Design a protein around this nucleic acid. Structure first.
Ligand SMILES: [Cl-]
Ligand SMILES: [Cl-]
Ligand SMILES: [Cl-]
Ligand SMILES: [Cl-]
Ligand SMILES: [Mn+2]
Ligand SMILES: [Mn+2]
Ligand SMILES: [Mn+2]
Ligand SMILES: [Mn+2]
Ligand SMILES: [Mn+2]
Ligand SMILES: [Mn+2]
Ligand SMILES: [Mn+2]
Ligand SMILES: [Mn+2]
Ligand SMILES: [Mn+2]
Ligand SMILES: [Mn+2]
Ligand SMILES: [Mn+2]
Ligand SMILES: [Mn+2]
Lengths: 97, 96, 93, 79, 96, 100, 98, 83
DNA sequence: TCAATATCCACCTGCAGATTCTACCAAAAGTGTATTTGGAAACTGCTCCATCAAAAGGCATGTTCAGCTGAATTCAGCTGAACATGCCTTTTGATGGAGCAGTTTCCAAATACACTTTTGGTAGAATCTGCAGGTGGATATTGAT
DNA sequence: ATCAATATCCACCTGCAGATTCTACCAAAAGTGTATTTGGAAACTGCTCCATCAAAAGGCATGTTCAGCTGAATTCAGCTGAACATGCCTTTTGATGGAGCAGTTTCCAAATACACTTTTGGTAGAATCTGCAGGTGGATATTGA
């Protein structure tokens, strides 16, 4: 009956994921999303395999970066738990809001 | 022979010239501009490949992959600034 | 048909600094993106420089002022060095 | 419900590469919202390049170009 | 000696001003800003236009380039209206 | 021969189509420039300046002044969501900030 | 007996005031002097058009005023009212200026 | 002709205080004034290095406002009004 | 510290996916000529930048003081991590067909040129006028009690 | 629940420092006739892109359970804002020399525009080869005691 303490695994995943480079959002769902958003701008559109891959790359790189800034904001508030207010502040200092 | 060999460069001086003309940058292009610009491009290329080369060596790897280019760039104050708004696909992020 | 890239030139330079190191396809993709980018940034600034100064020709002078404006301190020194060197060696042949 | 396709665990992983150790339960929906605006902005520009070129296939270049003008320059897909 | 003419957008800005606000003036310092504004958007559009053209191996910038440059550059409403005004002028102009 | 008529009038515009058609060719944007291009750009240019002068002119009125000044411009640019986004990285000398 | 505004009352008064005006807030000469000192350290024997120094001040104040807005968001995010160096640094870090 | 020194101190505590005000700042810690001087120096150096680079390329001895406008444009701090 | 549980770390190992390597052809890139012209001197007019003076009052300094804000401490509710489960959405992958990017291949409509007029704009004179900034009531807005 | 203080407001005033008109050229739009192209049509064609189908294989959705994190309360040393006296030094006005932009000309070294020649770089079938992804076995790190 063995169990790990809160966040012991957490730290572990950080180590893991900051060492690899694979995409972390599953391909299919991501493609489905890309196409649906796209269908609002032009209908019956086709996608180069690579265009969808570029989008995901760009997209995840961006998210990982925003989580970086978000964590800085959570830590600034003497917390270890990122929250929406943290994402919101980051995006406002970044000029995206 | 070619202008590159003449300039002692690996990079394609002639192409850089054709590219500077066709890119609507200016009406004319000095003879030196192509040479100069190519020298600069090669140098920076050498710099990154030098650092990413080490990136793979320090990883017991012989073929440089994106991860390596990313590790070399972000771990270098200057390259990092020059490429601060660029994201290298499949390069991940610095550990820690 | 034809789709030129800087791959070959990249690869040469590679061998010149790491004779026994190879480079993955994807990686060569990054190096191309890289070259094209800087190429554009440099040319762009040189383009602007000439326009500010009502000049109609981008000369090596423009390219280097452009290099000083774009590159971080040390990187810009060396780039200027290799640059004026290559032009020099060229005007002597 | 496609946006719901970008799942919690998938988002946990992103935050993790981001170095985040504890995640409030509301980050998940908050993240999808940012994620959606990001794609809408990039894609909208991209597709605009597509139509300009009179094509019906968004190309990796149409995306590289969009990202370039959103200030999110990406290396590895054609410059 | 001839103080070499310096073109501006002042008289046009001013003309337009009178159209929307018949009894309103504009300090020279605000005209200063209005001029910077025009040159700026002009550069952004021509710029995007220039690029769009290059991406499509097209050697000439046409009202279509300008238009899609506009759509890329301006936000929602502002775009919808600018495109209208431009199309309107272009056709008006062709039919004359 | 026939009498001269300016392209601006032909286009029904206040901005200088000729001048814009020139700045385009001289700015090294493309090998060549079509007939419409300048007409279309002078229009867009004229429309946007009518839009900020409309909002600026109101700012002036709201502040009981009859002559627009930089602060009136800022007030107009920052209170209008789209103009604000358009010029979100431009700074209006002498315009201050919105009273937040 | 002597009248005395409570801490912060004058402060909000000052905010309402300066957010209403558009005049520069750094003294002209002190600033022009700071420019020349920095310029000279880059290049000797340099001259400046009057407007060049004003253009610089205009930018500097516009930049500092904007940085303070973000700095303040950082303080408020920390449940504080007093901005501190931590804040200025968090702001610049996210601004990608570092 | 005299030596120039410590002019960063010309940016006085009260001047820095007014800027925070326009900036909407209610309360200010004692250490802000020097961080600010620090941050203003960096901002300035960077705009002046570029402006002056623009100057030299034009083989001139006078930094013009255009030099500065171009400098600012490159830095992503476009200024209108001297343009 | 002990002790069981999992992780994480190394050193080999063998195969399949990419790299390399090898063999060829339009399309650039290098030449050789004849012209063209951008813009580097060589002046030099004259705008405007650095300085000098001087006087004055707006403000920067320093200091005193204590209001109230930031930084500790505690602590209890409850939110978010770890997990063992069970099921289904994603991933893998030939297949086959078809929508479509690219190609050529035309050429009529549409730019680019080169001159030769014909104005629209611009640089100061000259003619006007918001509004800066000085005052005073009246209207709040504050802080003491 | 005032009410003495004193900061803020809002309209009235009117000389003048800037805004708006008034003239005159002249630089640059326009008008024309002529030579050159650009880049949309139309059939065409390999090719990626999409729609299926088919398995397992995870990998994600679920609930439980409780560790430990966050946010609420309370406390207080002392930092930071408000006031005030003092008097420095930024501002404001005005004049002056001369550095050094900026307008003209003069007119070669260097760049553009053909026309041909080669030479190179991109592309499409063949010989390696570097790790990925597993094993096994060995200390480690973590949690329970
Ligand atoms: Cl929140
Ligand atoms: Cl040259
Ligand atoms: Cl057109
Ligand atoms: Cl701090
Ligand atoms: Mn109106
Ligand atoms: Mn000439
Ligand atoms: Mn004193
Ligand atoms: Mn006390
Ligand atoms: Mn408190
Ligand atoms: Mn078809
Ligand atoms: Mn006239
Ligand atoms: Mn007043
Ligand atoms: Mn408990
Ligand atoms: Mn002189
Ligand atoms: Mn070859
Ligand atoms: Mn391995």
């Amino acid at each position: 009956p063995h169990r790990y303490r809160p966040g012991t695994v957490a730290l572990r995943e950080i180590r893991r994921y900051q060492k690899s480079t694979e995409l972390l959002i599953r391909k299919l769902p991501f493609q489905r999303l890309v196409r649906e958003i796209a269908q609002d701008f032009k209908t019956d559109l086709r996608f180069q395999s690579s265009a969808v891959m570029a989008l995901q790359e760009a997209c995840e790189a961006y998210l990982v970066g925003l989580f970086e800034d978000t964590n800085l904001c959570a830590i600034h508030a003497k917390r270890v738990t990122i929250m929406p207010k943290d994402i919101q502040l980051a995006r406002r200092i970044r000029g995206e809001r | 022979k070619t202008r590159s060999s003449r300039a002692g460069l690996q990079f394609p001086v002639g192409r850089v010239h054709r590219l500077l003309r066709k890119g609507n940058y200016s009406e004319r292009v000095g003879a030196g501009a192509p040479v100069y610009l190519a020298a600069v491009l090669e140098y920076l290329t050498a710099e990154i490949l030098e650092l990413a080369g080490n990136a793979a060596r320090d990883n017991k790897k012989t073929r440089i992959i994106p991860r390596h280019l990313q590790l070399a760039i972000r771990n270098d104050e200057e390259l990092n600034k020059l490429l601060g708004r660029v994201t290298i696909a499949q390069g991940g992020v610095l550990p820690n | 048909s034809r789709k030129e890239s800087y791959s070959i030139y990249v690869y040469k330079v590679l061998k010149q600094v790491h004779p026994d190191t190879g480079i993955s396809s994807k990686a060569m993709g990054i190096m191309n993106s890289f070259v094209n980018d800087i190429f554009e940034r440099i040319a762009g600034e040189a383009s602007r420089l000439a326009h500010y100064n009502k000049r109609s020709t981008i000369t090596s002078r423009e390219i280097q002022t452009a290099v000083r404006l774009l590159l971080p301190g040390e990187l810009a020194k060396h780039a200027v060095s290799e640059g004026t060197k290559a032009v020099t060696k060229y005007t002597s042949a | 419900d496609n946006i719901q396709g970008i799942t919690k665990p998938a988002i946990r992983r992103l935050a993790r590469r981001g170095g985040v150790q504890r995640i409030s339960g509301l980050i998940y929906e908050e993240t999808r919202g940012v994620l959606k605006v990001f794609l809408e902005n990039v894609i909208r520009d991209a597709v605009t390049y597509t139509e300009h070129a009179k094509r019906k296939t968004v190309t990796a270049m149409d995306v590289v170009y969009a990202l370039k003008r959103q200030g999110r320059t990406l290396y590895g897909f054609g410059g």
